[PDB]
Amino acid sequence: AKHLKFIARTVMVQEGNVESAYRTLNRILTMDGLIEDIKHRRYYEKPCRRRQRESYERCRRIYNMEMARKINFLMRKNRADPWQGC
Amino acid sequence: RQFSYLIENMARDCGEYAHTRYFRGGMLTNARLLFGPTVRLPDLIIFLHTLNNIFEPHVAVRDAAKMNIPTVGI
Amino acid sequence: ATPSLRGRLARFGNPRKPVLKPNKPLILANRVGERRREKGEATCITEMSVMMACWKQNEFRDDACRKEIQGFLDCAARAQEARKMRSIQETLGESGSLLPNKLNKLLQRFPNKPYLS
Amino acid sequence: DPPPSTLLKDYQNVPGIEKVDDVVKRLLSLEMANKKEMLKIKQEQFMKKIVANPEDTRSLEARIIALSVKIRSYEEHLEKHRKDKAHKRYLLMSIDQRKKMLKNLRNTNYDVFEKICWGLGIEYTFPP
Amino acid sequence: PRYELALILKAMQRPETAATLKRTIEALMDRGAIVRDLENLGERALPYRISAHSQQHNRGGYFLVDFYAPTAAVESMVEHLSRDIDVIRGNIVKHPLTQELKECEGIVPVPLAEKLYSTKKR
Amino acid sequence: TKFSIYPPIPGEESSLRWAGKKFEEIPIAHIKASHNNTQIQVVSASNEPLAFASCGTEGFRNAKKGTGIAAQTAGIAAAARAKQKGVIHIRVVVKGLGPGRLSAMHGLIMGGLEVISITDNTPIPHXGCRPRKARKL
Amino acid sequence: REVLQLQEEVKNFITRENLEARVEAALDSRKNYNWAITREGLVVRPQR
Amino acid sequence: SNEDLPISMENPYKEPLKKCILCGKHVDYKNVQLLSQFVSPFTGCIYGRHITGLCGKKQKEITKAIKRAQIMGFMPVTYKDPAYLKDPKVCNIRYRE
Amino acid sequence: YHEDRIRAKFYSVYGSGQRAFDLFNPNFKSTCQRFVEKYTELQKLGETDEEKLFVETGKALLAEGVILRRVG
RNA sequence: AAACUCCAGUUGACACAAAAUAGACUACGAAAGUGGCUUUAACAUAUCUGAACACACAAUAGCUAAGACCCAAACUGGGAUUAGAUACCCCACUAUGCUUAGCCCUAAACCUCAACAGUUAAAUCAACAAAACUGCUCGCCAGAACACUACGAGCCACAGCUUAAAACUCAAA
Ligand code: FES
Ligand SMILES: [K+]
Ligand SMILES: [K+]
Ligand SMILES: [K+]
Ligand SMILES: [Mg+2]
Ligand SMILES: [Mg+2]
Ligand SMILES: [Mg+2]
Ligand SMILES: [Mg+2]
Ligand SMILES: [Mg+2]
Ligand SMILES: [Mg+2]
Ligand SMILES: [Mg+2]
Ligand SMILES: [Mg+2]
Ligand SMILES: [Mg+2]
Ligand SMILES: [Mg+2]
Ligand SMILES: [Mg+2]
Ligand SMILES: [Mg+2]
Ligand SMILES: [Mg+2]
Ligand SMILES: [Mg+2]
Ligand SMILES: [Mg+2]
């Protein structure tokens, strides 16, 4: 309200491509966490519930990043069987 | 499996026996049912690899001991 | 980098209060989840809303709304074929990073070992 | 309390501190320092006044003096912060730990126990 | 102790800015402060609009005053700046150069936590 | 010169122009995309109102207002009244995550207006008023 | 060593005598605290 | 005994510990140029250490400096100051496809 | 091993040699091993300084025709 | 549907309310708790355990008195649903959540895992959970239900809190 306008959360359109500008804006707001933040703020999340959600989301990140790390580590072994028939 | 062919040939050349394939449950502890009541089991089992393909001990290591068969193993 | 797990769980020897309260053991399974079918939505409504606009102005006379009708008709045909295309490429995995079925056979060969042998 | 013009414990024994500009004396005095610097001067005065060896900080005498200075600081803090329950707990615990020191000093060295009580103005009381 | 006064002044002409700085440094001295230096950071657009003393401000002159003062002078000086109509925003912080930065050897890697779960077969 | 997605900063000397007008001079289309409605107001750079349309002013009622096609219709209506007043290029400022967030922008384009930028101004309190309690569904 | 260094600095401190002169001298000067860091850990001073 | 036996010592090939780009440098709330390199251009949001690559000590120093600078009148809150958009990109994040 | 300190410094100063290791030859000698052997010989001649014993070793090899391109 | 229509949108001025991002950090505090900024004061114990006979604390709700009041919100009213709907869904609004000064002293106050010291070898080990143990000390427990109850006692508590049984009943829990 006291800041300058048309600087924050502003994406310029190129060659009249408004779809790509909106997708870029939506991608910006998503990566910075604003879209998920806006949604969680529609109704009050009681602190006990917020702490449980944060714990769940942090455990999911650890599991997902460790499973992804194992997938990338083993992907080289997806090559054809070198000893087929034995 | 990199050495299955090599090991199978070494056994045939020395006049002995090789089992480099998937090991089916009970080859040793249930041999009489699988082969016959008069089947003679091995007197010595030599493991050139003691682990299976999921990095666990080959089941025959435990089953060789159950049948009181001495094992040589790398 | 995976977030740290040191001192995060309620355990003997850990003085602080627990940071994480996992309802499931933080241990990698030998399988990944199945490809989740994406929520479908009504399509071609933009073309459907141009056809139904001319009708309102042309007393629902198809003779005056030919170009808009032909647009909506073609758009529905493209979306009908597009679903047929996607389905084939989804099963083939032409665009997927890997198929859960193929990615689980690979994990079967290198199973996570939470126990001693 | 020591005068504000008092020099800091670190700068009191540097050679030539008495010939520096007055401005430099203000910047090295208690007036320009936090209260913890004033408490170090109070602890030093009590040590020389009471303990036989003012350099031995691990003796039971020095600990009673060190803890007694902390107790007076908490009492002054709580005079201005009467709803500070955290520091009120620290005061009551510190008083309980000084009594445990004074008890052990009375049992081991009575002559020193008497000098500590006179020097610090402590009236030892037997528990009920 | 040593403090740093971050002073944003109303955008004014050179004569009124000098009178405001002198009036502010004298207030520090009247409270027992030893003023060490005065630095001009330049007049610039504020990061946002600031309302101060029934006026709206979009530009301001950024100044720093490095000084030593007794702990009791800080509270009394903050009250003085709140009444000066030529000051947009003034904050007194502990001088950053007093805090000595500890040496750092580098990033110590954290190994994946082990033995979180018993090795029994599940 | 390469394209910059960052808008031109007022007071600096940019070369971008739209019908001879600078970015600071392009009118603004304010889209309020609510959960049950979408409101579109086009204003000049001096904050003069030029056109207003919402799903309710376009004859939609109750749950039909909270649809994409209802917002698209509101966009076309606002574009038509704005085009008569001399508006071609607009800066879009959308606040809210309602269903007509993107559809309201399409209607502005189908109505003859050219969108040169998109701005999100969805209010996010940084700590603010306590929202209503969660629903039991 | 700290008392010696401090004794020299006090010569350049502001007093009621040089206050007006030090104010005018400050209004003519500019102090810049801005600088940027690079991916290599190098400081990039401003172009002034 | 025997000369060829291994000897006890510390790893001679051990690599020096890695350092953050700000290791050994002072983080001041008045250096808005540096602080601006760790906030989002579009939203002004402070980047987490997984994006900035800073160590824990400097992530805290940067965070505390930003919050101080913002409320003291040195740094904008809702966007990165456009003056600093052309500074070196030290954060690992890409917003364009 | 004691020579591991010499190998760590050699790799830092001169990097890995552009010559390729042949781990099949049981008597293979790399540029680093050649440096270590000369470094050991000069130490047995009574020299005890480390920074001096390292600079003289490089010169000896250059005289023998060895290519030592400093990394930096 | 009811409700508002001195309503809604843009812009400007404008908090005794709450504190995005940072935080993928795991820090501080005895616990309860503590994540906007600044400053002042400031985080007991140079053996350990130790007060249910004391002392000092103790989320939320609540009480007394005087204030503030954006938003949320028991109760209550209205709308809708329903066989009914004293609910769930929608709207409005109060106590209350805030501050000051005093009370109240309770939580699944649970990380249901006591403090201090030590160990990883032997028998590893009912099951599950967060692997199994040693030394020492305090607190606590001894079938279910009756019973967070009765009586007595203490207490700023008067529909309260703490301490806390018995009879009858069952072969289980
Ligand atoms: S790694 Fe040294 S301060 Fe960051
Ligand atoms: K956070
Ligand atoms: K905040
Ligand atoms: K619990
Ligand atoms: Mg222990
Ligand atoms: Mg559970
Ligand atoms: Mg004790
Ligand atoms: Mg309470
Ligand atoms: Mg209350
Ligand atoms: Mg309300
Ligand atoms: Mg009220
Ligand atoms: Mg408040
Ligand atoms: Mg709790
Ligand atoms: Mg308990
Ligand atoms: Mg205990
Ligand atoms: Mg019982
Ligand atoms: Mg109860
Ligand atoms: Mg009772
Ligand atoms: Mg009673």
Coordinates of all heavy atoms in Angstrom, one line a residue, chain J residues 58-61 104-106, ligand 8:
Chain J
rA58 P 3.4 -18.1 35.7 OP1 3.5 -17.0 34.7 OP2 2.6 -17.9 36.9 O5' 2.9 -19.4 35.0 C5' 3.6 -20.0 33.9 C4' 3.3 -21.5 33.7 O4' 3.7 -22.2 34.9 C3' 1.8 -21.8 33.6 O3' 1.3 -21.6 32.3 C2' 1.7 -23.2 34.0 O2' 2.1 -24.1 33.0 C1' 2.7 -23.2 35.2 N9 2.1 -22.9 36.5 C8 2.3 -21.8 37.2 N7 1.6 -21.8 38.4 C5 1.0 -23.1 38.4 C6 0.1 -23.7 39.3 N6 -0.3 -23.1 40.4 N1 -0.4 -24.9 39.0 C2 0.0 -25.5 37.8 N3 0.8 -25.0 36.9 C4 1.3 -23.8 37.2
rA59 P 0.2 -20.5 32.0 OP1 0.8 -19.1 32.1 OP2 -1.0 -20.8 32.8 O5' -0.2 -20.7 30.5 C5' 0.7 -20.7 29.4 C4' 0.3 -21.5 28.2 O4' 0.2 -22.9 28.5 C3' -1.1 -21.1 27.7 O3' -1.1 -19.9 26.9 C2' -1.5 -22.3 26.9 O2' -0.8 -22.3 25.6 C1' -0.9 -23.5 27.7 N9 -1.8 -24.1 28.6 C8 -2.0 -23.9 30.0 N7 -3.0 -24.6 30.5 C5 -3.5 -25.3 29.4 C6 -4.6 -26.2 29.3 N6 -5.3 -26.6 30.3 N1 -4.8 -26.7 28.0 C2 -4.0 -26.3 27.0 N3 -3.0 -25.5 27.0 C4 -2.8 -25.0 28.2
rU60 P -2.4 -18.9 27.1 OP1 -2.2 -17.8 26.1 OP2 -2.4 -18.5 28.6 O5' -3.6 -19.7 26.8 C5' -4.0 -20.1 25.5 C4' -5.1 -21.1 25.5 O4' -4.8 -22.3 26.3 C3' -6.4 -20.6 26.1 O3' -7.2 -19.8 25.2 C2' -7.1 -21.9 26.4 O2' -7.7 -22.5 25.3 C1' -6.0 -22.8 26.9 N1 -5.8 -22.8 28.3 C2 -6.6 -23.6 29.1 O2 -7.4 -24.4 28.6 N3 -6.4 -23.5 30.4 C4 -5.5 -22.7 31.1 O4 -5.5 -22.8 32.3 C5 -4.7 -21.9 30.3 C6 -4.9 -21.9 28.9
rA61 P -8.0 -18.6 25.8 OP1 -8.7 -17.9 24.7 OP2 -7.1 -17.8 26.7 O5' -9.2 -19.3 26.7 C5' -10.1 -20.1 26.1 C4' -10.9 -20.9 27.1 O4' -10.0 -21.8 27.9 C3' -11.6 -20.1 28.2 O3' -12.8 -19.5 27.7 C2' -11.8 -21.1 29.3 O2' -12.9 -22.0 29.0 C1' -10.5 -21.9 29.2 N9 -9.5 -21.3 30.1 C8 -8.4 -20.5 29.8 N7 -7.7 -20.1 30.9 C5 -8.4 -20.8 31.9 C6 -8.1 -20.8 33.3 N6 -7.1 -20.2 33.9 N1 -9.0 -21.5 34.1 C2 -10.0 -22.2 33.5 N3 -10.3 -22.2 32.2 C4 -9.5 -21.5 31.5
rC104 P -5.9 -18.0 44.0 OP1 -6.2 -18.5 45.3 OP2 -4.5 -17.8 43.5 O5' -6.6 -19.0 42.9 C5' -8.0 -19.1 42.9 C4' -8.5 -19.7 41.6 O4' -8.3 -18.7 40.5 C3' -7.8 -20.9 41.1 O3' -8.3 -22.1 41.7 C2' -7.9 -20.9 39.6 O2' -9.2 -21.4 39.2 C1' -7.9 -19.4 39.3 N1 -6.6 -18.8 38.9 C2 -6.2 -19.1 37.5 O2 -7.0 -19.7 36.8 N3 -5.0 -18.6 37.1 C4 -4.3 -17.9 37.9 N4 -3.1 -17.4 37.5 C5 -4.7 -17.6 39.3 C6 -5.8 -18.1 39.7
rC105 P -7.4 -23.1 42.6 OP1 -8.2 -24.1 43.1 OP2 -6.6 -22.2 43.6 O5' -6.4 -23.7 41.6 C5' -6.8 -24.5 40.5 C4' -5.7 -24.8 39.5 O4' -5.1 -23.6 39.0 C3' -4.6 -25.6 40.1 O3' -4.0 -26.5 39.1 C2' -3.6 -24.6 40.5 O2' -2.2 -25.0 40.6 C1' -3.7 -23.6 39.3 N1 -3.2 -22.2 39.6 C2 -2.4 -21.6 38.7 O2 -2.1 -22.2 37.7 N3 -1.9 -20.3 39.0 C4 -2.3 -19.7 40.1 N4 -1.9 -18.5 40.3 C5 -3.2 -20.3 41.0 C6 -3.6 -21.6 40.7
rU106 P -3.6 -28.0 39.4 OP1 -4.1 -28.3 40.8 OP2 -2.2 -28.1 39.1 O5' -4.4 -28.9 38.4 C5' -5.8 -28.9 38.5 C4' -6.4 -28.7 37.1 O4' -6.3 -27.3 36.7 C3' -5.8 -29.4 35.9 O3' -6.3 -30.8 35.9 C2' -6.2 -28.6 34.7 O2' -7.5 -28.9 34.3 C1' -6.1 -27.2 35.3 N1 -4.9 -26.4 35.0 C2 -4.6 -26.1 33.7 O2 -5.4 -26.4 32.8 N3 -3.5 -25.4 33.4 C4 -2.5 -25.1 34.4 O4 -1.5 -24.5 34.0 C5 -2.8 -25.4 35.7 C6 -4.0 -26.1 36.0
Ligands
MG8 MG -2.4 -20.6 34.1

